[PDB]
Design an enzyme around this catalytic site. Structure first.
Site, mmCIF file in Angstrom:
data_model
loop_
_atom_site.group_PDB
_atom_site.id
_atom_site.type_symbol
_atom_site.label_atom_id
_atom_site.label_comp_id
_atom_site.label_asym_id
_atom_site.label_seq_id
_atom_site.Cartn_x
_atom_site.Cartn_y
_atom_site.Cartn_z
ATOM 1 N N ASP A 225 0.839 -1.188 0.000
ATOM 2 C CA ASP A 225 0.000 0.000 0.000
ATOM 3 C C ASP A 225 0.878 1.243 0.000
ATOM 4 O OD1 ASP A 225 -2.051 1.841 0.222
ATOM 5 O OD2 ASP A 225 -2.284 1.566 2.387
ATOM 6 N N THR B 68 -3.221 0.338 -4.582
ATOM 7 C CA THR B 68 -3.585 1.491 -3.762
ATOM 8 C C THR B 68 -3.816 2.672 -4.699
ATOM 9 O OG1 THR B 68 -2.949 2.823 -1.843
ATOM 10 C CG2 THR B 68 -1.230 2.248 -3.436
ATOM 11 N N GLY B 69 -4.024 3.852 -4.121
ATOM 12 C CA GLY B 69 -4.054 5.072 -4.900
ATOM 13 C C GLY B 69 -5.389 5.317 -5.579
HETATM 14 F F1 ALF Z 1 -4.350 0.763 1.809
HETATM 15 AL AL1 ALF Z 1 -4.291 2.324 0.932
HETATM 16 F F2 ALF Z 1 -4.240 3.882 0.054
HETATM 17 F F3 ALF Z 1 -3.652 3.144 2.410
HETATM 18 F F4 ALF Z 1 -4.941 1.546 -0.530
HETATM 19 MG MG LIG Z 2 -2.543 2.598 4.203
#
Ligand code: ALF
Ligand SMILES: [Mg+2]
Ligand SMILES: *[C@@H]1O[C@H](CO)[C@@H](O[C@@H]2O[C@H](CO)[C@@H](O[C@@H]3O[C@H](CO)[C@@H](O)[C@H](O)[C@@H]3O)[C@H](O)[C@H]2NC(C)=O)[C@H](O)[C@H]1NC(C)=O
Ligand SMILES: *[C@@H]1O[C@H](CO)[C@@H](O)[C@H](O)[C@H]1NC(C)=O
Ligand SMILES: *[C@@H]1O[C@H](CO)[C@@H](O)[C@H](O)[C@H]1NC(C)=O
Lengths: 575, 328
Positions: free
Chosen positions: A202, A236-237
């Site tokens: 992540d 993520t993102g």
């Molecule tokens: F687990 Al995340 F942005 F913090 F997808």
């Molecule tokens: Mg995270």
């Protein structure tokens, strides 16, 4: 929060039934309980079993005590090696079964040809050569029982538990102002850190401080693992926007599938696992990441700022993503080498130890007699050949920690899984066959001819047994000495301690003092004091030890000279 | 979370250690040093072993024309051979006479276990209560066999006599002492008679002789220190052989008072009372004479093995230079 102080009954149930070897040794107790087929004493299995079972109970009793105190105040993942170890235990059974029947057939005919006419081998039981051959099948299961390693399991938790603690204690994987060290919260997934193929990370909370700006050392940590041939995936993102902006950063960071909800996060992890059959490590923080943490083979949880909630649901929970370098390149890489070296030596030193019975089967009418003291089988696995391999499994270092970081390319040895295959199991099995053959036949040739023959002549079976055991103990303890690359003062102490401890114990076991206490149980009184004061016996042991070690030294030297390994190439160049 | 980790060499995996690397300069020398040390050891053993003078007379007589073949079918229990042998070179120093048994698996599992160790140690309880391990020979008729077990029962029971045939042709028996032919520990530690009493007759109550033994374990030797469970021949026999073809100390020959050798070169006749039948299972019987050496006994295998291992050590040592030189 079990172990209610009256709950020792299910721990052995969890130890015995669940583990294939444990209940076999239990089934082995019943096999050798009945005198009709009992070729070894019950001591031979209980003493290693209780020690192996006892140590495992201690390692788990402490864990529950922590839970009780935790709950007193308030008021499944399996390694690739684990599967390979499991199969090899079964592989030993069939080989053990096959040889026992094979030697049973050889014994059945030996009774019709020689045993029947051999008036000295008469016992009053009018047993036909088929029935005597059948009965000895169980006898040769008992004698060759230690072909199945009894301390194989307990040693593995000890290596893994010790290796996990080095993650906790690593000052390099420690954060200063947050005062959060690294924490290995599962102590059974260690060699897999050296076998990682995929990394799932992540971004918000792990690659950043979440306070966002990239996290210090990520651009060089991401590149280092890439040079170690570990693919990195980020799940993520928000769409290509945040993807390419930071994806192009971190030195090109590779699949950047973004927008993934936690349902998609775990779903994507299974795509690589099922359709590629590869080991994966998931690193993240926060609730949305806990989905991949469970599915992935190894789960890593950054403390982060999202919330101290994805760390306890993981396997390792160090404070910064940059600490991923030491987790794999140092802790993971060394763990795989330490584990594979342990198993490679562990199966060898049992096959080299038990198979002497098989060679000695051809010179006793295939009657399934032990070539050792019955008490030598008891302590061989727990005492004479336990510490030095354990210390190697913890302290061995092919290269320094600093040099391991500077050479990420040493990791591929774990991804490719080269240091312990299913093939290399048989090489250690063959190496046990040859060593047992040497450990038996060189004393045989000396014992066939004159060996210190005078008023004090070690030309007997017991001296023959002590000589083979003495050469065996020195050989295996020198063999592990040849295996270790990091000769710490404690590594040297264990190797010579094991040999010294062996030689110390025989004298106590073979002294007249212990004979009066238990005359039947301990019957080699005076054998060591008489067999080891004769230069011919020591020349035999030296010759036996030499002829079973120099070929290893020569083969080892040739293998690195003809096909140098990555470790050897850089280890040669100190700079 | 928790404070900083403790800073120590062990915890940080920074202990001071030696990293031995098998360079071409560290493993090659030990090969030549092994080869340079093993060959002289092999030469010393080999020439010393060949300097030992040994003669073996196989007297079982299975083959025809052996002049006691009648002992294979002894219509009368006492059978005697008479084998003539000649010594080309005299024997110097202490000389040991042995008996050899071939194709005799004294190391059989049913055979080895068949013995009561506590009884052999002189245990009152186990004397009259033989271990179930020696089941076939626990008792014969009504009371337990004191030397229970197959091994004690099937004890080699020939009597090998050595005679010197001089120019006058009248046989001259040579000295032969059976004492001190077993391990010191075995006589004094491992093997003991039942405790108590002074006469050995009164020390064995309610125990019969083994079935195979012609007479019980009372009068094995007239010497009170060599009769009973501590009989030297018995201990030597009970001391299980490692292999089927084995040889056991039988008698000693001590240095003769005169300056002449212990066994001067000449004609000798072996008069043996044939009591041990081993021809059913193709067993051989031998009498072996050997002389002591300052370095063990006659072991051409160890001598030849050291020559070989010392030699292949050079072959491995020299060959490994070629690989080193090519890949420098
Ligand atoms: F687990 Al995340 F942005 F913090 F997808
Ligand atoms: Mg995270
Ligand atoms: C020397 O040792 C041999 C064995 O190596 C002795 O031969 C054995 O003698 C016993 C008798 O003490 C035999 O047991 C039984 O004997 C009765 C007759 O008393 C006979 O009817 C049974 O059938 C049975 O044979 C035993 O069978 C026999 N061994 C063999 C292989 O046949 C020999 O007696 C010993 N001699 C001396 C002088 O110690
Ligand atoms: C062996 O020697 C004895 C006495 O010297 C003699 O009577 C006998 O004929 C000899 N036998 C052989 C085969 O030489
Ligand atoms: C051989 O020994 C026996 C037993 O003492 C004896 O009776 C005989 O006279 C000796 N000489 C022989 C058989 O020529």
């Amino acid at each position: 929060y079990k172990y209610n102080a009256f709950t020792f009954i299910p721990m052995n149930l969890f130890e015995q039934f669940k583990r294939a070897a444990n209940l076999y040794f239990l089934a082995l107790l019943i096999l050798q309980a009945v005198p009709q087929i009992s070729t070894l004493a019950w001591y031979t299995t209980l003493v290693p079993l209780l020690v192996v079972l006892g140590v495992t109970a201690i390692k788990d009793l402490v864990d529950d005590v922590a839970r009780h105190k935790m709950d007193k105040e308030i008021n499944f993942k399996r390694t690739k090696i684990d599967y390979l170890m499991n199969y090899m235990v079964y592989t030993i059974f069939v080989v053990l079964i096959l040889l026992s029947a094979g030697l049973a057939i050889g014994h059945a005919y030996w009774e019709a040809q020689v045993g029947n006419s051999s008036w000295y081998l008469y016992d009053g039981e009018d047993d036909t050569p088929s029935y005597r051959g059948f009965l000895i099948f169980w006898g040769y299961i008992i004698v060759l029982n230690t072909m199945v390693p009894i301390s194989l399991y307990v040693s593995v938790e000890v290596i893994r538990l010790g290796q996990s603690h080095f993650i906790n204690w690593d000052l390099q994987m420690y954060y200063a102002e947050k005062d959060t060290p690294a924490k290995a919260r599962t102590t059974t997934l260690n060699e897999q850190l050296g076998q990682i193929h995929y990394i799932f990370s992540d971004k918000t909370g792990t690659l950043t401080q979440n306070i966002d700006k990239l996290q210090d050392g990520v651009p060089e940590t991401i590149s280092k693992l890439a040079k170690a041939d570990i693919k990195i995936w980020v799940l993520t993102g928000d769409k290509k926007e945040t993807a390419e902006n930071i994806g192009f950063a971190c030195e090109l960071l590779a699949v950047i599938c973004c927008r993934v909800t936690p349902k998609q996060k775990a779903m994507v992890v299974d795509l690589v696992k099922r359709y590629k059959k590869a080991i994966t490590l998931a690193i993240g923080d926060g609730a949305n990441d806990v989905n991949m943490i469970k599915t992935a083979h190894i789960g890593v949880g950054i403390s982060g700022q999202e919330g101290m909630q994805a760390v306890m649901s993981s396997d390792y929970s160090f404070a910064q993503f940059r600490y991923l370098q030491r987790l794999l390149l140092v802790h993971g890489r060394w763990s795989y080498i330490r584990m594979c070296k342990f198993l490679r030596y562990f199966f060898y030193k049992n096959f080299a130890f038990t198979l002497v019975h098989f060679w000695y089967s051809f010179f006793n009418g295939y009657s399934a007699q032990t070539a050792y003291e019955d008490w030598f089988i008891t302590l061989y696995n727990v005492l004479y050949t336990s510490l030095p391999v354990l210390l190697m499994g913890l302290l061995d270092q092919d290269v320094s920690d600093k040099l391991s970081l500077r050479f990420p390319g040493l990791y591929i040895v774990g991804q490719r899984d080269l240091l312990f295959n299913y093939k290399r199991f048989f090489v250690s099995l063959l190496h046990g066959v040859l060593t047992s053959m040497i450990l038996f036949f060189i004393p045989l040739g000396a014992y066939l001819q004159t060996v210190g023959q005078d008023g004090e002549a070690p030309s007997d079976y017991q001296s023959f047994a002590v000589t083979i055991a003495s050469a065996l103990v020195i050989t295996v303890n020198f063999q592990i000495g040849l295996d270790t690359s990091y000769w710490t003062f404690v590594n040297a102490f264990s190797i010579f301690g094991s040999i010294a401890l062996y030689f110390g114990i025989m004298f106590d076991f073979h002294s007249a003092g212990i004979h009066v206490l238990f005359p039947s149980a301990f019957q080699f009184t005076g054998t060591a004091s008489n067999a080891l004061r004769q230069p011919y016996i020591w020349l035999t042991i030296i010759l036996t030890v030499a002829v079973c070690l120099l070929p290893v030294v020569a083969i080892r030297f040739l293998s690195m000279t003809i096909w140098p390994s990555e470790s050897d190439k850089i280890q040669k160049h100190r700079k | 979370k928790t404070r900083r980790p403790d800073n120590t060499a062990f915890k940080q995996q920074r202990l001071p250690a030696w990293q031995p690397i098998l360079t071409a300069g560290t493993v090659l020398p030990i090969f030549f040093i092994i080869g340079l040390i093993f060959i002289p050891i092999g030469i010393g053993i080999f020439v010393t072993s060949n300097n030992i003078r040994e003669i073996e007379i196989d007297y079982t007589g299975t083959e025809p024309s052996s002049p006691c073949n009648k002992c294979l079918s002894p219509d009368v229990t006492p059978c005697f051979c008479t084998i003539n042998f000649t010594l080309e070179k005299s024997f110097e120093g202490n000389v040991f006479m042995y008996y050899g048994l071939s194709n005799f698996y004294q190391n059989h599992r049913r055979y080895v276990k068949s013995r009561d160790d506590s009884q052999l140690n002189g245990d009152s309880s186990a004397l009259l209560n033989p271990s179930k391990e020696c089941e076939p020979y626990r008792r014969n008729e009504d009371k337990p066999i004191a030397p229970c077990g197959a091994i004690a029962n099937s004890m080699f029971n020939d009597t090998l006599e050595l005679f010197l045939i001089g120019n006058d042709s009248y046989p001259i028996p040579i000295a032969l002492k059976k004492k001190g032919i077993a391990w010191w520990t075995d006589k004094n530690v491992k093997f003991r008679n039942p405790p108590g009493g002074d006469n050995l007759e009164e020390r064995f109550k309610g125990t019969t002789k083994p079935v195979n033994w012609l007479k019980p374990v009372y009068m094995l030797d007239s010497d009170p220190d060599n009769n009973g469970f501590i009989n030297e021949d018995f201990i030597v026999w009970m001391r299980t052989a490692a292999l089927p073809t084995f040889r056991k100390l039988y008698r000693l020959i001590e240095r003769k008072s005169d300056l002449h050798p212990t066994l001067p070169a000449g004609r000798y006749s072996l008069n043996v009372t044939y009591n041990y039948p081993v021809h059913y299972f193709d067993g051989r019987k031998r009498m072996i004479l050997s002389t002591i050496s300052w370095m063990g006994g006659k072991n051409p295998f160890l001598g030849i093995a050291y020559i070989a291992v010392g030699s292949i050590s050079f072959l491995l040592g020299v060959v490994l230079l070629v690989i080193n030189h090519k890949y420098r």
